[PDB]
């Protein structure tokens, strides 16, 4: 197995997920117009958040420790049992919070209390989201790129079918339910694929508790908590700087660039958690880690650069196809943003190493470094160049950050503190 082959499997599943999302999104737009989209905005962002929140964000830790103990049946059972207990316990608590406070949640999502029933349904749907994401994370712990990809492919296709029946039956609220069911229905193929492929015995998923492993998986919850604040906060007051001196139109130009660039990054690095994270988890010697990091960088940097150059060449086609023709001025932002994306992908290689070593301390330092650099550059370039400055700030940020990642890796590899 290799990063390239894992990328081939993961690209196929990600492309189907993108095609399914574009299909469902256009069905929702044609069916319910801007009023339906504006009312679905918060609810859809909640569905995204639940993809990590429903299982308490331990998924990367599940992958990390399954990889570490993939040849240790006793510890592996403890790992999967504790992970099952943590996902079951948290998802159950989440379901109770949702059903008990369905009225305040509906008010915060839609502006009135008319969606309590949908919120109570989501309380059960997020269990499928949490459990499905756990099974995928287990497969990734075994570096099963094919099982992961086949599961997501079946789930996307059945998700589109479920969305069609759901909105045809129940109108707008049925459509929203289908949106929540898109990431939840993966649990059906994921469970089938995991058992059928002989990855682990089914009994491993029985909830158990191990205090040590629970504390270790909690480190990945804490990284998920930190990540959901720092850079999101950064982009929020980046938009603040933008609006302070420019129009909302320019703000929309930048937000459109950022959101499509983030989706581009998620598609491009999706195989990192499938291959890179479990592989680096198993390696402990500095020579072996360096070899894998160098080999990964030698593959991903030219591949992402070639892909991003192609995207920039077709930026007008990418805008006309992927986004609503209401700006068409974001083309000038593509170059800077795409360069920053190439270096950010390179910086992800070091970032997944930190994940693979469960280093909460280096995770904090990586996040604060990215936040502060983004802030120094945004505070400099945004007031002078608007959305173009925001793209320049993002690019300059990850030029410096990737260089910093290299330097810190060299100091760590040579054991500068010892």
């Amino acid at each position: 197995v290799s990063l390239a082959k894992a990328s081939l499997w993961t690209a196929a599943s990600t492309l189907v997920k993108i095609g399914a999302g574009l299909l469902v999104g256009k069905l929702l737009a044609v069916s319910f117009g801007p009023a339906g989209l504006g009312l679905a905005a918060n609810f859809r962002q909640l569905i995204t958040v639940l993809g990590v929140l429903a299982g308490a964000g331990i998924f990367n830790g599940v992958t990390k420790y399954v990889a570490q103990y993939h040849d240790n049946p006793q510890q592996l059972r403890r790992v999967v049992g504790t992970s099952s207990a943590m996902v079951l316990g948290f998802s159950t608590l989440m379901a109770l919070v949702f059903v008990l406070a369905a009225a305040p949640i509906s008010q915060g999502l839609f502006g009135n209390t008319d969606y309590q029933g949908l919120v109570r349904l989501v309380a059960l749907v997020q269990m499928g989201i949490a459990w499905g994401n756990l099974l995928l994370a287990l497969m990734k712990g075994f570096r099963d790129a094919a099982g992961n990809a086949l599961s997501l492919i079946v789930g996307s296709l059945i998700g589109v079918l479920a969305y069609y029946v759901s909105y045809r039956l129940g109108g707008y609220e049925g459509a929203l339910l289908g949106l929540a069911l898109i990431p939840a229905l993966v649990v059906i193929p994921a469970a089938i694929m995991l058992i059928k492929r002989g990855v682990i015995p089914l009994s491993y998923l029985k909830p158990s508790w191990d205090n040590g492993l629970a504390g270790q998986l909690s480190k990945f919850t804490l990284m998920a908590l930190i990540t959901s604040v720092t850079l999101p906060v950064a982009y929020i007051m980046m938009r603040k700087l933008l609006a302070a001196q420019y129009s909302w139109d320019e703000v929309g130009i930048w937000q459109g660039v950022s959101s499509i660039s983030d989706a581009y990054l998620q598609f491009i690095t999706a195989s990192f958690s499938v291959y890179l994270l479990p592989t680096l988890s198993r390696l402990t010697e500095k020579r072996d880690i360096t070899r894998e990091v160098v080999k990964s960088l030698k593959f991903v940097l030219p591949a992402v650069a070639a892909a991003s150059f192609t995207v920039w060449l077709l930026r007008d086609f990418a805008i006309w196809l992927l986004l609503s023709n209401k700006f068409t001025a974001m083309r000038d932002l593509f170059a800077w943003q795409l360069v920053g994306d190439v270096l950010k992908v390179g910086a992800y290689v070091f970032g997944y190493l930190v994940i693979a070593k469960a280093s909460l301390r280096f995770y904090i330092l990586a996040e604060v470094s990215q936040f502060t650099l983004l802030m120094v550059f945004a505070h400099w370039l945004i007031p002078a160049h608007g959305a173009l400055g925001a793209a320049q700030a993002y690019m300059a940020t990850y030029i410096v950050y990737f260089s910093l990642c290299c330097g810190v890796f060299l100091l760590w590899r040579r054991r500068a503190l010892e």
């Epitope: 319910f32 009312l39 008319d114 969606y115 949908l118 039956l169 109108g171 707008y172 609220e173 049925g174």
Partner: nanobody, 125 residues
Framework: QLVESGGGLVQAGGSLGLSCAAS????????MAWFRQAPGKEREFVAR????????DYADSVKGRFTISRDNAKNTIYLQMNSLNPGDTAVYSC?????????????????????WGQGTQVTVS
């Protein structure tokens, strides 16, 4: 987009007529509905008239007692309420939405109607 008229303090057993006017242009394509919300509960479905064949739907608590109708000439809808019992005391609101928002069986869900009126009070002594 929607304004309500009628209602108030009415003696139990007496009749009452609510009416709702709509602005805009395209009105014959909007499904029209009445909802009510009593003090302490949530918005519940009352009655609904379609945009096409003039079909009607009623909650089981108001069937036979309440009758919804519409007039596409003046873009208004009405709710006749006979045999008013104390359980009918609530704020009544008219709602408008397109048939794609209701689907096949979602016509009773208030979240499928994005356009609402201010609500008129009905108190059955």
């Amino acid at each position: 987009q929607l304004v309500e008229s009628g209602g108030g303090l009415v003696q139990a057993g007496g009749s009452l007529g609510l009416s709702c006017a709509a602005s805009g242009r395209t009105f014959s394509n909007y499904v029209m509905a009445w909802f009510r919300q009593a003090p302490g509960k949530e918005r519940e479905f009352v009655a609904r008239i379609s945009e096409s064949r003039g079909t009607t739907d009623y909650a089981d608590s108001v069937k036979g007692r309440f009758t919804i109708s519409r007039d596409n000439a003046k873009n208004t809808i009405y709710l006749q309420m006979n045999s008013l019992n104390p359980g009918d005391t609530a704020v009544y609101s008219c709602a408008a939405t397109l048939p794609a928002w209701t689907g096949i069986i979602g016509g009773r869900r208030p979240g499928n109607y994005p356009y609402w009126g201010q609500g008129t009070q009905v108190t059955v002594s």
